[PDB]
Amino acid sequence: GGDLANEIARCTKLLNALNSGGDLANEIARCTKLLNALNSGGDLANEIARCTKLLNALNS
């Protein structure tokens, strides 16, 4: 339930903590891509659309 910038930061931290066993490889890559979308030439709106479901699941 925080603002979106603080929620993306939290969500990144929770994925890395939960990936101790390598079980979130694809979710970490989607997260890293979105975090780097202003440098990568990516479509920031389309990546945030596809990642929304994960942010929603972990939103505080």
Q: For the chain, how far is it from start to end, CA to CA, in angstroms? A: 4
Q: Which residue has the tokens 């603080």?
A: 6
Domain layout of the chain by residue ranges:
1-60
Structural method: X-ray
Q: Give the ranges where 1-60 is alpha helix by DSSP (H).
A: 4-18, 25-35, 37-40, 44-58
* CA–CA separation, 54 and 44 (whole Å): 16
> Token digits for 38?
């202003």
Residue with tokens 């975090």: 35
- What's this structure's resolution in Å? 1.2
Amino acid identity at 11: C
Question: Taking the CB of residue 33, how many other CB atoms lie within 10 A of it?
Answer: 14
DSSP annotation of 19 reads: T
